[PDB]
């Protein structure tokens, strides 16, 4: 409709993936490993990827064993492209594994002009009393990847995966990670830096 339903809780932005710059016109894709926080673009396409460090992500990277629902919100921007000239589609795919043999756990298909939003959820669940160690050889446990495909990277400028734990979420165990490094005008700070 026109009158929209009310958004609510705090979702923190975890992984941005800007699309390769001009003149690159071909179809391209990217994969967000939602648990381990990794962004692997297809082939040798120079996507500009950043993994931010909100509390969600630091927990997801450091927690060994995880359990329960995480709500995702994939936002898509957004080039200065006349609406009648828009031909960009965004196909996304939840997957357990990245291997050819595995099927998708969910497919979404978006062709909103300019910009778009897609809220979904998925529950991490595993063998060890409902807990899953992501990509552990034990019990051949697996991650959740989020494959995303831009049919037109000139029009789709960037993806943006925001996440939120459902209240039921639970972790256990620590992982020794290396030191986490610190951190287009779609932003208030970035508009100031282009005139200074």
């Amino acid at each position: 409709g026109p009158v929209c339903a009310e958004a609510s809780d705090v979702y923190s932005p975890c992984m941005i993936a800007s699309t390769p710059p001009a003149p690159f016109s071909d179809v391209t894709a990217v994969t967000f490993d939602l648990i381990n926080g990794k962004i692997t673009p297809v082939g040798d396409d120079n996507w500009n990827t950043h993994i931010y460090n909100p509390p969600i992500m630091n927990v997801l990277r450091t927690a060994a064993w995880k359990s329960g629902t995480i709500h995702v919100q994939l936002n898509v921007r957004g080039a200065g492209v006349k609406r009648a000239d828009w031909d960009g589609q965004v196909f996304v795919y939840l997957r357990q594994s990245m291997n050819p043999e595995s099927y998708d756990a969910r497919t979404f298909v978006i062709s909103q002009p300019g910009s778009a939003m897609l809220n979904f959820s998925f529950d991490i669940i595993g063998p060890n009393s409902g807990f899953e160690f992501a990509e552990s050889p034990w019990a051949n446990q697996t991650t959740w990847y989020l494959e995303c495909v831009a049919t037109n990277p000139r029009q789709i400028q960037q993806f943006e995966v925001n996440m939120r734990f459902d209240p039921n979420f639970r972790v256990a165990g620590n992982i020794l990670m290396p030191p986490f490094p610190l951190s287009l005008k779609f932003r208030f700070r970035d508009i100031e830096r282009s005139k200074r």
């Binding site: 291997n99 043999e101 063998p127 552990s136 050889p137 034990w138 019990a139 051949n140």
Partner: peptide, 18 residues
Amino acid sequence: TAWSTQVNPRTTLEADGC
């Protein structure tokens, strides 16, 4: 623990946790 109902066919005996 529980173990997976399916494994990838390519996984060898050396690396298979079921």
